[PDB]
Amino acid sequence: GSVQIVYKPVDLSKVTSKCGSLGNIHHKPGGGQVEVKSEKLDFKDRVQSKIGSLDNITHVPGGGNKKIETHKLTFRE
Amino acid sequence: GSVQIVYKPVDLSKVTSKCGSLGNIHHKPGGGQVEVKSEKLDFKDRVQSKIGSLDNITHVPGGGNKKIETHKLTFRE
C-alpha cells in the first residue's frame, strides 16, 4: 500500500585534462577508392547507414573528456 | 686504297594487330602516399629523374605495336 522513496544521487568530480602544449600534429592521408553495386534497398526503423563513406577526420580538442550520467526511474505498478 | 659498298637493307612486314572488340575495361586505383627528405641534389649529364612520381596510367590503343629500325654506318679510316 504505502510507499516512500528517497533518491539523492550526489556526484562530484575534478576531471582535469591538463596539457602543456601539442606541437607538430599532422593528418596526411591519401585518397583511396570505393565502389558499390546494389539493386534495391528498403531501410526502416531507426537506421543510420553509410555507403561509400570515405572520410578523413581530425578530432583534436585541446583538453577533452566526455562525461555522462544517464539516470532513470520507474514505479509503474 | 679503292673501296666499294652496297647496302640494300630491304624490309617488309604485315604487322597486324586485329581485334573484334574490347568491352569492359577499367582502371580503378586507390591513392597511396609518398614522402621524401633529401637535403641537396646536383644532377648532370642527361638525367631524367622522377621524385614522388605517383602516377596512374592507362595506355590502351585499339590496335597497337611499335616498330623500330635503327640503322647506322661508319667508314672513318
Swiss-Prot record, chains A, B:
Cited function: Promotes microtubule assembly and stability, and might be involved in the establishment and maintenance of neuronal polarity. The C-terminus binds axonal microtubules while the N-terminus binds neural plasma membrane components, suggesting that tau functions as a linker protein between both. Axonal polarity is predetermined by TAU/MAPT localization (in the neuronal cell) in the domain of the cell body defined by the centrosome. The short isoforms allow plasticity of the cytoskeleton whereas the longer isoforms may preferentially play a role in its stabilization.
Modified residues (Omega-N-methylarginine): 46
Species this protein is from: Homo sapiens
Tissue expression per record: Expressed in neurons. Isoform PNS-tau is expressed in the peripheral nervous system while the others are expressed in the central nervous system.
Effect of residue 34 to M: In FTD1; ultrastructural and biochemical characteristics indistinguishable from Alzheimer disease; accelerates aggregation of tau into filaments
Effect of residue 66 to I: In PIDB; 90% reduction in the rate of microtubule assembly
Domain of life: Eukaryota
Protein's recorded name: Microtubule-associated protein tau
Post-translational modification: Phosphorylation at serine and threonine residues in S-P or T-P motifs by proline-directed protein kinases (PDPK1, CDK1, CDK5, GSK3, MAPK) (only 2-3 sites per protein in interphase, seven-fold increase in mitosis, and in the form associated with paired helical filaments (PHF-tau)), and at serine residues in K-X-G-S motifs by MAP/microtubule affinity-regulating kinase (MARK1, MARK2, MARK3 or MARK4), causing detachment from microtubules, and their disassembly. Phosphorylation decreases with age.
Residues modified as N6,N6-dimethyllysine: 8
Self-association and partners: Interacts with MARK1, MARK2, MARK3 and MARK4. Interacts with PSMC2 through SQSTM1. Interacts with SQSTM1 when polyubiquitinated. Interacts with FKBP4. Binds to CSNK1D. Interacts with SGK1. Interacts with PIN1. Interacts with LRRK2. Interacts with LRP1, leading to endocytosis; this interaction is reduced in the presence of LRPAP1/RAP.
First and last residues of every Tau/MAP repeat: 3-33, 34-65
Disease listed for this protein: In Alzheimer disease, the neuronal cytoskeleton in the brain is progressively disrupted and replaced by tangles of paired helical filaments (PHF) and straight filaments, mainly composed of hyperphosphorylated forms of TAU (PHF-TAU or AD P-TAU). O-GlcNAcylation is greatly reduced in Alzheimer disease brain cerebral cortex leading to an increase in TAU/MAPT phosphorylations.
Name of the gene: MAPT
Residue numbers of Phosphoserine PTMs: 2, 21, 49, 53
